[PDB]
């Protein structure tokens with residue numbers, strides 16, 4: 001049960017892929033590697049069951065950049081059978097570190113869970 005527990009949550013900007021833009025999103029990282037985003041913080045169970053974005057951070061790559069926006073981090077991960085890169089930015093390097101440290105820790109936990 002605590003496998004589906006929330007490890008970290010908060011606001012961040014998700015980068016456009018083919019369009020230059022930053023979309024505001026509220027993301028929750030769960031202990032089973034699920035990383036889900038919403039346009040606003042989910043108020044209830046129903047709002048939680050309808051995420052706009054949903055990635056798995058198992059075995060991901062975590063990169064940190066300052067261009068074009070400072071405090072940006074990139075995640076290279078597997079969406080089913082396709083490797084994808086998603087880009088996010090937060091307000092401070094302190095929060096970026098909280099996010100990349102939380103993500104890596106979860107990935108390491110899933111691996112060690114192959115126990």
Ligand SMILES: O=P(O)(O)Oc1ccc(OP(=O)(O)O)c(OP(=O)(O)O)c1OP(=O)(O)O
Pocket residue numbers: 014015016017018019023052053054086
């Ligand atoms: O695969 P995801 O990261 O879950 O979703 C994407 C992916 C690509 C999008 O196209 P783009 O507008 O960013 O070029 C894209 O933008 P779009 O579908 O909303 O036009 C995505 O949806 P979202 O960022 O608005 O939630």
Ligand code: NA
Pocket residue numbers: 019
């Ligand atoms: Na689009």
